[PDB]
């Protein structure tokens, strides 16, 4: 269950967001920026809002609760009042099928 099957790449239009629910775990949000796919936790770090119900502006997702925002590629805050980075999950497309990582990316074994 390292890679979670989400949907067919063609099932998502550019600039859309899809929520991925997981048993016994917090939901994720998969974003399609152009022809690329990204994913983060679905719950806004500033509260209890669902980012999949927000608005995607390019590679920046805006929370529907207070207007906070995050960069979907890095998970870093883009607009106040958000200050806590989102956990980011790797996404890959195999056979035109979108898969999202079951574990978040870590500042472990990567670029210095």
């Amino acid at each position: 269950q390292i890679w979670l099957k989400v949907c067919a790449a063609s099932d998502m239009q550019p600039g859309t967001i899809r929520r991925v629910n997981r048993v016994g775990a917090a939901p994720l949000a998969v974003y399609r920026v152009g022809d690329q796919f990204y994913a983060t936790e679905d719950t806004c770090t500033h509260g209890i809002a669902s980012l999949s119900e927000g608005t995607l502006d390019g590679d920046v997702i805006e929370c529907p609760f207070h207007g906070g925002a995050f960069n979907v590629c890095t998970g870093m805050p883009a607009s106040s009042p958000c200050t806590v980075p989102l956990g980011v999950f790797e996404v890959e497309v195999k056979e035109g099928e979108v898969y999202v990582a079951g574990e978040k990316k870590l500042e472990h074994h990567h670029h210095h």
């Binding site: 500033h46 509260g47 209890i48 529907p64 609760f65 207070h66 207007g67 009042p81």
Partner: protein
């Protein structure tokens, strides 16, 4: 438009609610108890920012805006009710009828062209369960039941209570009241021990978001509200821990109460059963102005005869009022006052960091934004402005 547009633009889920700093117009609101207004003795009060006058004539209540049409003085500065059905301004004697607000006479100039052509604003007033409700709105009013919680108007339901002015915006009072986790502030209430109540410290939510509440928008009477269902799938917290060690315990009393909690527009909470398994509690947070509200507390208990009513009143006075309405709810008063600074500049509506149980508050904010009957504005207070 009572708030910075920049802020309203940020709270897309409940902007009307955030803008409703002065309350919602076109709803009924309790302002005093029937026994507080006597025949032929006008009483003043401020509701939704407007100064009003209420009078009882032949046992029926009438409400006139307490502001002369002429130079805008409050008639109440020097009350002159010269005939049973009218009130005369103490300044230039413009006289108004209590029943329709029509300017029927002017003692300083009985030939004035204004006579019979102007009308002072009147508001509908209705008495129910010994409570005085004023419809702060325009046009024919809807039935009172629409703006009251279920069962409040039941025939056998005997209502008793108290009212006072509290220093906080009405919304802070509403949210605190419907706040599932604020139960923590009541852990040391005398009502807990003195009435052997079962009272957790909080709740560990269970189930999905939709399951946390029940939004009512299909009530035959038109009622609009939200039920707090956090306890249906949640695990009540009776042992609070820090670092794994228990530092606080809930109340392991035998009496089960407050298992049915709901908030209703325009802003009234229903707690059942409370403060005792055989009673029902209702409390309103009525907007007086942007900084204050009436904390209208009412407790109901079915009574079939005068004997039970008398007995009920005795217990209310000797136990329920002091032990519950005050001994329990007093902590709610300073709690709401504690949030004033954070929301005073309207910034709190953006910077607040909510957690799971606030799902109930969010549901309320959305219900209120979608089903309120109007946003009271400062212009309603000074005089509507427009150019068509």
């Amino acid at each position: 438009a009572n708030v910075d547009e920049a802020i309203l633009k940020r709270v897309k889920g409940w902007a009307p609610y955030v803008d409703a700093k002065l309350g919602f117009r076109n709803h009924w609101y309790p302002v005093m108890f029937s026994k507080e207004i006597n025949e032929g003795e006008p009483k003043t009060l401020k509701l939704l920012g407007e100064n009003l006058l209420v009078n009882r004539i032949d046992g029926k209540l009438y409400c006139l805006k307490d502001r002369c049409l002429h130079r805008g003085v409050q008639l109440s500065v020097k009350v002159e009710c010269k005939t049973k059905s009218t009130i005369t301004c103490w300044y230039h004697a413009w006289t108004y009828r209590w029943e329709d607000g029509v300017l029927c006479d002017i003692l300083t100039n009985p030939t004035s062209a204004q006579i019979g052509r102007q009308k002072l604003k009147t508001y509908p007033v209705q008495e129910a369960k010994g409570c005085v409700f004023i419809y702060l709105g325009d046009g024919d009013p809807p039935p009172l039941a629409r703006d009251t919680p279920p069962n409040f108007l039941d025939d056998d339901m005997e209502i008793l209570g108290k009212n006072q002015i509290i220093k906080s915006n009405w919304r802070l009072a509403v949210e605190n009241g419907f706040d599932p986790s604020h139960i923590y502030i009541h852990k040391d209430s005398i009502l807990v021990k003195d009435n052997d109540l079962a009272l957790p410290l909080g709740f560990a939510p269970g189930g999905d978001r939709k399951q946390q509440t029940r939004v009512v928008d299909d009530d035959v009477v038109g009622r609009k509200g939200v039920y707090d269902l956090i306890g249906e799938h949640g695990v009540p917290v009776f042992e609070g821990t820090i670092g794994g060690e228990v530092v606080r315990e809930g109340a392991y009393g035998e009496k089960i109460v407050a298992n049915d909690i709901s908030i209703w527009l325009p802003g009234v909470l229903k707690v059942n059963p409370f403060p005792n398994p055989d009673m029902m509690y209702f409390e309103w947070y009525v907007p007086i102005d942007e900084n204050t509200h009436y904390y209208f507390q009412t407790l109901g208990k079915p009574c079939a005869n005068d004997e039970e009513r008398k007995k009920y009143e005795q217990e209310f006075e000797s136990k329920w009022k002091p032990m519950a309405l005050e001994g329990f709810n007093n902590d709610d008063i300073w709690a709401r006052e504690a949030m004033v600074d954070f929301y005073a500049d309207d910034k709190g509506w953006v910077n607040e960091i909510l957690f799971e149980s606030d799902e109930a508050i969010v549901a309320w904010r959305k219900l209120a934004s979608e089903h309120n009957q109007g946003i009271q504005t400062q212009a309603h207070v000074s005089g509507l402005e427009h150019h068509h």
